[PDB]
Amino acid sequence: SELRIILVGKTGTGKSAAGNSILRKQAFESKLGSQTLTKTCSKSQGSWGNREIVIIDTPDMFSWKDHCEALYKEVQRCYLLSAPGPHVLLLVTQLGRYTSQDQQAAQRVKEIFGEDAMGHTIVLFTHKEDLNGGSLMDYMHDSDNKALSKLVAACGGRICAFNNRAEGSNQDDQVKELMDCIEDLLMEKNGDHYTNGLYSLIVKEFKQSLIKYMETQRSYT
């Protein structure tokens, strides 16, 4: 009955702080008034509605253009920490600021986890206060950002808004909204988690397979 979530997103959008909001603790390094840069994967756990939540935070470099040795090592770490596969990938973006770099982060999710990972992805929008009291759905409807529309479509319209600084009922409400989105997704998937050939495989063997897998995914994109 455990729920495994992987966090991804463009640098500066606040994915680690979103993880902390969900778990209601300082699970991942994130300091008010400073910019976060996550160098290595880590995991933390909490609960919601009597089930255990396992969150895997990823290095910022997953979202970048790079293919260094450390990248392959950390991807293998991410797969080991999230095995036998994530129920949800949470792609973290800042409201009103979906740029080429967010597009790259989305492309990298497909590269690292497979294009079909979009079918278990939910788009988070941080800085929800910038809706100025309007609804997120109206914001999506009225947005002329074509790349953002394409991401939201790939994700089956699954979206949620957060203020990472939320407290009390504001915090409880945003986490509940996310959990409701997750529950709807899992109902539709008969409770299935996402998986792929690399999860099935689960150090040198994995590395070689991952490089080939990523190359294949780049072509599809």
PDB file of N, CA, C and O in Angstrom, residues 10-14 91-99 102 123-130 139 148 162:
ATOM      1  N   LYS A  10      12.879  21.925 -13.240  1.00  0.00           N
ATOM      2  CA  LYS A  10      13.888  22.932 -13.522  1.00  0.00           C
ATOM      3  C   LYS A  10      14.473  23.505 -12.225  1.00  0.00           C
ATOM      4  O   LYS A  10      13.760  23.714 -11.236  1.00  0.00           O
ATOM      5  N   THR A  11      15.762  23.807 -12.257  1.00  0.00           N
ATOM      6  CA  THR A  11      16.418  24.486 -11.144  1.00  0.00           C
ATOM      7  C   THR A  11      15.688  25.755 -10.747  1.00  0.00           C
ATOM      8  O   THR A  11      15.317  26.571 -11.608  1.00  0.00           O
ATOM      9  N   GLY A  12      15.475  25.890  -9.442  1.00  0.00           N
ATOM     10  CA  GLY A  12      14.887  27.082  -8.858  1.00  0.00           C
ATOM     11  C   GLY A  12      13.395  27.035  -8.632  1.00  0.00           C
ATOM     12  O   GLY A  12      12.849  27.958  -8.007  1.00  0.00           O
ATOM     13  N   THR A  13      12.729  25.983  -9.119  1.00  0.00           N
ATOM     14  CA  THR A  13      11.264  25.906  -8.999  1.00  0.00           C
ATOM     15  C   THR A  13      10.787  25.415  -7.634  1.00  0.00           C
ATOM     16  O   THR A  13       9.600  25.512  -7.337  1.00  0.00           O
ATOM     17  N   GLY A  14      11.694  24.880  -6.812  1.00  0.00           N
ATOM     18  CA  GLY A  14      11.329  24.505  -5.445  1.00  0.00           C
ATOM     19  C   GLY A  14      10.854  23.087  -5.233  1.00  0.00           C
ATOM     20  O   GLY A  14      10.040  22.842  -4.334  1.00  0.00           O
ATOM     21  N   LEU A  91       6.440  16.657 -11.549  1.00  0.00           N
ATOM     22  CA  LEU A  91       7.232  17.609 -12.338  1.00  0.00           C
ATOM     23  C   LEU A  91       6.927  19.013 -11.869  1.00  0.00           C
ATOM     24  O   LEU A  91       5.816  19.526 -12.053  1.00  0.00           O
ATOM     25  N   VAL A  92       7.920  19.621 -11.221  1.00  0.00           N
ATOM     26  CA  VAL A  92       7.683  20.860 -10.476  1.00  0.00           C
ATOM     27  C   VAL A  92       8.059  22.086 -11.315  1.00  0.00           C
ATOM     28  O   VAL A  92       9.203  22.220 -11.764  1.00  0.00           O
ATOM     29  N   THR A  93       7.083  22.957 -11.522  1.00  0.00           N
ATOM     30  CA  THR A  93       7.269  24.171 -12.313  1.00  0.00           C
ATOM     31  C   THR A  93       6.776  25.333 -11.459  1.00  0.00           C
ATOM     32  O   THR A  93       6.041  25.118 -10.497  1.00  0.00           O
ATOM     33  N   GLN A  94       7.197  26.561 -11.786  1.00  0.00           N
ATOM     34  CA  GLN A  94       6.713  27.749 -11.092  1.00  0.00           C
ATOM     35  C   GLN A  94       5.595  28.382 -11.924  1.00  0.00           C
ATOM     36  O   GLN A  94       5.754  28.604 -13.125  1.00  0.00           O
ATOM     37  N   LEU A  95       4.476  28.714 -11.282  1.00  0.00           N
ATOM     38  CA  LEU A  95       3.351  29.327 -11.974  1.00  0.00           C
ATOM     39  C   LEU A  95       3.747  30.571 -12.754  1.00  0.00           C
ATOM     40  O   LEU A  95       4.380  31.482 -12.204  1.00  0.00           O
ATOM     41  N   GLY A  96       3.377  30.599 -14.031  1.00  0.00           N
ATOM     42  CA  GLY A  96       3.656  31.756 -14.889  1.00  0.00           C
ATOM     43  C   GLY A  96       5.051  31.811 -15.474  1.00  0.00           C
ATOM     44  O   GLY A  96       5.393  32.793 -16.156  1.00  0.00           O
ATOM     45  N   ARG A  97       5.860  30.772 -15.220  1.00  0.00           N
ATOM     46  CA  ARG A  97       7.275  30.790 -15.614  1.00  0.00           C
ATOM     47  C   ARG A  97       7.704  29.469 -16.233  1.00  0.00           C
ATOM     48  O   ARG A  97       8.764  28.914 -15.877  1.00  0.00           O
ATOM     49  N   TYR A  98       6.899  28.971 -17.175  1.00  0.00           N
ATOM     50  CA  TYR A  98       7.234  27.753 -17.906  1.00  0.00           C
ATOM     51  C   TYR A  98       8.072  28.101 -19.140  1.00  0.00           C
ATOM     52  O   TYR A  98       7.552  28.644 -20.132  1.00  0.00           O
ATOM     53  N   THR A  99       9.365  27.810 -19.074  1.00  0.00           N
ATOM     54  CA  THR A  99      10.334  28.265 -20.082  1.00  0.00           C
ATOM     55  C   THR A  99      10.979  27.100 -20.833  1.00  0.00           C
ATOM     56  O   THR A  99      10.656  25.933 -20.592  1.00  0.00           O
ATOM     57  N   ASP A 102      12.177  24.547 -18.456  1.00  0.00           N
ATOM     58  CA  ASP A 102      11.156  23.604 -17.994  1.00  0.00           C
ATOM     59  C   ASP A 102      10.877  22.546 -19.056  1.00  0.00           C
ATOM     60  O   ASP A 102      10.708  21.378 -18.723  1.00  0.00           O
ATOM     61  N   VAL A 123       1.783  17.594 -13.021  1.00  0.00           N
ATOM     62  CA  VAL A 123       2.498  18.883 -13.069  1.00  0.00           C
ATOM     63  C   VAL A 123       2.167  19.704 -11.832  1.00  0.00           C
ATOM     64  O   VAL A 123       1.003  19.961 -11.551  1.00  0.00           O
ATOM     65  N   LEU A 124       3.193  20.061 -11.066  1.00  0.00           N
ATOM     66  CA  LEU A 124       3.010  20.934  -9.932  1.00  0.00           C
ATOM     67  C   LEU A 124       3.330  22.365 -10.361  1.00  0.00           C
ATOM     68  O   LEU A 124       4.228  22.611 -11.187  1.00  0.00           O
ATOM     69  N   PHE A 125       2.560  23.301  -9.834  1.00  0.00           N
ATOM     70  CA  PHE A 125       2.813  24.723 -10.063  1.00  0.00           C
ATOM     71  C   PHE A 125       3.055  25.375  -8.717  1.00  0.00           C
ATOM     72  O   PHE A 125       2.116  25.521  -7.925  1.00  0.00           O
ATOM     73  N   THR A 126       4.305  25.748  -8.460  1.00  0.00           N
ATOM     74  CA  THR A 126       4.623  26.462  -7.205  1.00  0.00           C
ATOM     75  C   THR A 126       4.286  27.950  -7.334  1.00  0.00           C
ATOM     76  O   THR A 126       3.898  28.430  -8.398  1.00  0.00           O
ATOM     77  N   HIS A 127       4.400  28.677  -6.226  1.00  0.00           N
ATOM     78  CA  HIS A 127       4.020  30.097  -6.180  1.00  0.00           C
ATOM     79  C   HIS A 127       2.533  30.305  -6.553  1.00  0.00           C
ATOM     80  O   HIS A 127       2.164  31.233  -7.298  1.00  0.00           O
ATOM     81  N   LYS A 128       1.671  29.450  -6.005  1.00  0.00           N
ATOM     82  CA  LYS A 128       0.232  29.548  -6.286  1.00  0.00           C
ATOM     83  C   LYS A 128      -0.412  30.876  -5.875  1.00  0.00           C
ATOM     84  O   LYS A 128      -1.460  31.244  -6.405  1.00  0.00           O
ATOM     85  N   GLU A 129       0.217  31.590  -4.944  1.00  0.00           N
ATOM     86  CA  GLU A 129      -0.220  32.936  -4.567  1.00  0.00           C
ATOM     87  C   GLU A 129      -0.292  33.861  -5.792  1.00  0.00           C
ATOM     88  O   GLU A 129      -1.057  34.829  -5.799  1.00  0.00           O
ATOM     89  N   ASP A 130       0.508  33.558  -6.817  1.00  0.00           N
ATOM     90  CA  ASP A 130       0.516  34.371  -8.036  1.00  0.00           C
ATOM     91  C   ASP A 130      -0.709  34.200  -8.933  1.00  0.00           C
ATOM     92  O   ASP A 130      -0.871  34.950  -9.923  1.00  0.00           O
ATOM     93  N   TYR A 139      -6.466  29.622 -15.107  1.00  0.00           N
ATOM     94  CA  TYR A 139      -5.142  30.014 -15.542  1.00  0.00           C
ATOM     95  C   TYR A 139      -4.689  29.144 -16.717  1.00  0.00           C
ATOM     96  O   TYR A 139      -4.202  29.662 -17.727  1.00  0.00           O
ATOM     97  N   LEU A 148       3.639  24.667 -22.591  1.00  0.00           N
ATOM     98  CA  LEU A 148       2.999  24.260 -21.341  1.00  0.00           C
ATOM     99  C   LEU A 148       1.735  23.438 -21.629  1.00  0.00           C
ATOM    100  O   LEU A 148       1.489  22.413 -20.992  1.00  0.00           O
ATOM    101  N   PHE A 162       0.833  24.675  -5.526  1.00  0.00           N
ATOM    102  CA  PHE A 162       1.421  24.730  -4.180  1.00  0.00           C
ATOM    103  C   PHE A 162       1.962  26.134  -3.896  1.00  0.00           C
ATOM    104  O   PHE A 162       2.433  26.825  -4.804  1.00  0.00           O
TER     105      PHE A 162
END
